[PDB]
């Protein structure tokens, strides 16, 4: 039920091997301190700049998404911590509660 | 005499640091076996295929340029080796040369 032509299946295998040979070539380049000249040969100046900005875009997305979780958690905890104090205050004995009211001036 | 605006000089430094941060990020990704997913995040499918084909293009250029040097060298050596044999044959003594002609039947 695969339903794929031998031509398309051979091209997909070709692109897969060509991609795997590049990442392996780049890996050995880092191990030989040749990554910088290889990237200058493999990439255009506009593609190198695009990659540099995309890292910053990922950084701003992660920082933006994490900062929205922190305000979501701090606002929720600020409400959850009030309810914990309310329940604990209801459970306190009268001798403590009435003494707190006398220090409630 | 540099004659460059502070705006352009700051942007060139920004692109340089962004590019250096990417290659450093990719280096640590190879050391952490995270290169394959990082490249899938940083590159589009069309850009990954372009890089895979460019490696093959470099391979065919190097193989093509080297094969042209080998035929250039083999044709030149084939001429240089005939002249060496001609000179060495002129320098040979008569007793050898005349004996070679008697085995020249
Ligand atoms: N004894 C309280 C302590 C506490 C938690 N959150 C609070 C907020 C206000 C006052 C007290 C608390 C408790 O177990 O939950
Ligand atoms: N004695 C010859 C050997 C040699 C080199 N090339 C040759 C070609 C043909 C015959 C002999 C040779 C030399 O020193 O050069």
Author numbering:
A (entry chain A), B (entry chain A): 1 to 105
Share the article's original sentences.
Tryptophan repressor (TrpR) was one of the earliest gene-regulatory proteins for which a high-resolution crystal structure was determined in complex with its DNA regulatory site. The TrpR dimer is formed from deeply intertwined monomers and is related to domain-swapped proteins, even though it does not meet a proposed definition predicated on the existence of a stably folded monomeric structure, which TrpR apparently does not have. Formation of the extended domain-swapped structure depends on the conversion of two interhelical turns in each subunit of native dimeric TrpR into helical segments, resulting in the formation of a continuous, nearly straight α-helix of 47 residues. TrpR crystals in the typical native dimeric form have previously been reported for a variant in which Val58 is replaced by isoleucine (Val58Ile), one of 19 TrpR mutants created by Arvidson et al. to explore the role of the identity of the residue at position 58, which forms part of the l-Trp-binding site.
The present work was thus carried out using the abundantly available crystals of Val58Ile ds-TrpR soaked with l-Trp to evaluate the ability of ds-TrpR to bind l-Trp and to define the ligand orientation, which are here documented for the first time for any ds-TrpR. The structures of free and l-Trp-soaked cleaved Val58Ile ds-TrpR were determined to 2.05 and 2.45 Å resolution, respectively, and refined to an R work/R free of 26.8/29.9% and 27.8/29.1%, respectively. In the l-Trp-soaked form distinct changes are observed in the side-chain conformations of Arg84, which comes within hydrogen-bonding distance of the l-Trp carboxylate, and of Thr81, which rotates to within hydrogen-bondimg distance of the indole ring N atom. The l-Trp ligand has an average B factor of ∼75 Å2, which is lower than the overall B factor of the structure (96 Å2) and is in the range of the surrounding residues (∼70–90 Å2). In the second chain of dimeric TrpR the backbone carbonyl O atoms of Leu41 and Leu43 are positioned to interact with the l-Trp α-amino group, with Asn40 as an additional potential hydrogen-bonding partner. All of these potential ligand interactions are maintained in Val58Ile ds-TrpR, except that the origin of Arg54 is a third protein chain rather than the first chain as in dimeric TrpR. In the domain-swapped form the long extended helix positions Arg54 away from the ligand-binding site formed by residues of its own chain, bringing it instead into an equivalent position at the ligand-binding site of the next dimer-like node of the extended array. Thus, in Val58Ile ds-TrpR the physiological ligand l-Trp occupies the equivalent binding site and engages in all of the same functional-group interactions as in native dimeric TrpR.
